[PDB]
Design a protein around this ligand. Structure first.
Ligand SMILES: Cc1cc2nc3c(=O)[nH]c(=O)nc-3n(C[C@H](O)[C@H](O)[C@H](O)COP(=O)(O)OP(=O)(O)OC[C@H]3O[C@@H](n4cnc5c(N)ncnc54)[C@H](O)[C@@H]3O)c2cc1C
Length: 503
């Protein structure tokens, strides 16, 4: 094993106090940069929360919830009457109603819409459940999956989604298309996925039409879709069978000069994906071409060591690697997986703030080597974006880096980001990750979107919480870790509720 590969393996389940301590100074923003990151993070989160004046309207609510000293139920009912009084066409009649008959007695149609500014279903469920059974539960889950999943899908076929590309692409967005589907269980499954990926590359590459890997659209692929039972696949079978499919897809992407990105999945597959990447990078037919993309997950303890490996690989193979830095999508599964195995520790962090610190340290490592790596910073977190904006230094050039976001999640934040400075934008490119597929391929992806959007540690969840002040929402992660350090007695202790798998 090479030097960089060996250091990866040694960091696999490093104790959290040790790994967070090492990361801390690598992630610390210098005082002037930290200041500018704070102001920018604050300003992005302010426009985000207060689009359509959501805070200022809640302000006028509380200011009258006290001025008359009324309840919340007793105050929404006042609006329903106020709305119904504003519907009297003539002010003469409206006022005379208030000064004559508005002290005796008495509609609440829009009490629900007003309540959004200010039970017995368990019975209807118990009745329906035992009556219609498991087939009713299975249909309810399938319906709710499509209903909640619609917002995250750009189209059922690649052609449908490609036809939606111009709107935001003319605004300066880019796209990475994902043919939904993963964890192939049979040879037939992985074959079908292979053909789905090939057809997508032809379609995406004809749409790209020479625009190249930076400005033009790319594709994202999941290795688990290409090999049957990837989760437990032996090394020799993966090289013999998966690798020639990865190679074939990458050659095809090169012919069209489009970016081809290898998504990161569960942590027990990191090692074998590095082996496939190492081989792919030395194919003669790919010499001189920089379209190979690779995702790395900052919630893993190995991420910084993976970066030193990737830096050495780009040098040895004479290319610029497209590296998408993400926090990670499989955190709940990682925790549960590690607890069932009862091993030395976790391969991921157990406090969200540690992942934030890991992401900022890794971002610094990536931005230090623009000749070897084109960093792609995938995030919906206003502070994370603002910190990367400042970390990247003055004198941005389009090929220095890009942001990325998921379809259905990033658009309000990146409306402030991609576009002209004259229109109030930061003028930074963003690549939209665009899932494509029908209902039969949506389940696993929708669930990870639900876990992401529904966690109270997620930025997109906290920002909807108007009782959380903006300064706490965009608080600096290194400073947060040192707060816990001072309160708890040492830096980087595991989450209090997530004991080691052996405890
Ligand atoms: C364009 C794009 C492509 C992506 N591709 C991939 C991919 O190929 N593979 C993949 O795994 N992820 C991928 N992701 C990331 C994943 O899907 C989430 O979108 C991402 O992790 C959210 O980070 P955020 O900075 O927007 O949110 P933030 O809310 O600031 O952070 C949320 C993240 O913190 C982490 N986290 C939550 N709780 C804890 C905890 N208690 N301890 C430690 N860490 C915690 C999780 O990673 C969670 O997603 C991608 C994201 C984007 C935007």
């Amino acid at each position: 094993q090479s030097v960089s590969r060996a250091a990866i393996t040694a960091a696999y389940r490093r104790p959290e106090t040790e790994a967070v301590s090492m990361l801390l100074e690598q992630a610390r923003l210098p005082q002037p940069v930290a200041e500018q990151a704070h102001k920018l993070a604050y300003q992005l989160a302010d426009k985000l929360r207060n689009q359509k004046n959501a805070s200022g309207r809640a302000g006028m609510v509380q200011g009258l919830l006290q001025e008359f000293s009324l309840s919340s139920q007793e105050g929404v009912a006042l609006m329903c009457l106020a709305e119904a009084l504003l519907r009297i066409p003539d002010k003469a009649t409206r006022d005379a109603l208030i000064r004559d008959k508005i002290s005796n007695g008495n509609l609440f149609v829009n009490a629900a819409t007003w309540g959004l500014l200010f039970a017995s279903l368990s019975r209807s469920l118990n009745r329906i459940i035992g009556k219609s059974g498991e087939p009713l539960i299975r249909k309810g889950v399938d319906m709710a999956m499509r209903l909640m999943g619609e917002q995250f899908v750009t189209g059922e076929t690649i052609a449908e989604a490609l036809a939606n590309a111009r709107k935001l692409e003319e605004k300066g967005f880019r796209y990475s298309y994902d043919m939904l589907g993963e964890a192939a269980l049979t040879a037939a499954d992985a074959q079908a996925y292979m053909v789905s990926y090939q057809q997508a590359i032809h379609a995406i590459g004809k749409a790209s039409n020479g625009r190249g890997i930076y400005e033009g659209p790319g594709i994202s692929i999941k290795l688990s879709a290409l090999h049957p039972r990837y989760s437990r696949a032996q090394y020799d079978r993966v090289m013999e069978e998966l690798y020639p499919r990865l190679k074939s897809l990458t050659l095809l992407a090169r012919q069209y000069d489009i970016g081809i990105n290898i998504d990161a999945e569960e942590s027990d597959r990191l090692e074998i994906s590095l082996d496939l990447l190492e081989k792919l990078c030395f194919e003669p037919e790919l010499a001189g071409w920089n379209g190979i993309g690779f995702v790395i997950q900052a919630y893993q303890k190995r991420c910084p060591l993976v970066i030193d490996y990737l830096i050495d690989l780009a040098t040895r193979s004479r290319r610029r690697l497209m590296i998408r830095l993400v926090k990670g999508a499989y955190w709940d599964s990682e925790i549960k997986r590690a607890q069932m195995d009862g091993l030395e520790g976790y391969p991921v962090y157990t406090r969200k703030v540690y992942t934030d610190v890991s992401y900022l340290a890794c971002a610094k490592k990536l931005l230090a080597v623009p000749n070897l790596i084109y960093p792609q910073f995938a995030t919906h977190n206003a502070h994370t974006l603002a910190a990367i904006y400042q970390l990247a230094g003055q004198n941005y050039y389009p090929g220095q880096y890009e942001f990325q976001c998921l379809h259905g999640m990033g658009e309000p934040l990146y409306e402030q980001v991609t576009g002209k400075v004259a229109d109030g934008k930061l003028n930074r490119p963003c690549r939209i990750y665009a899932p494509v597929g029908t209902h039969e391929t949506l389940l696993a992806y929708l669930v990870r979107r639900l876990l992401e959007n529904g966690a109270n540690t997620s930025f997109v969840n906290r920002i909807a919480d108007t009782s959380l002040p903006l300064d706490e929402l965009v608080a600096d992660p290194v400073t947060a870790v040192e707060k816990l350090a001072q309160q708890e007695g040492q830096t980087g202790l595991p989450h209090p509720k997530i004991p080691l798998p052996r405890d």
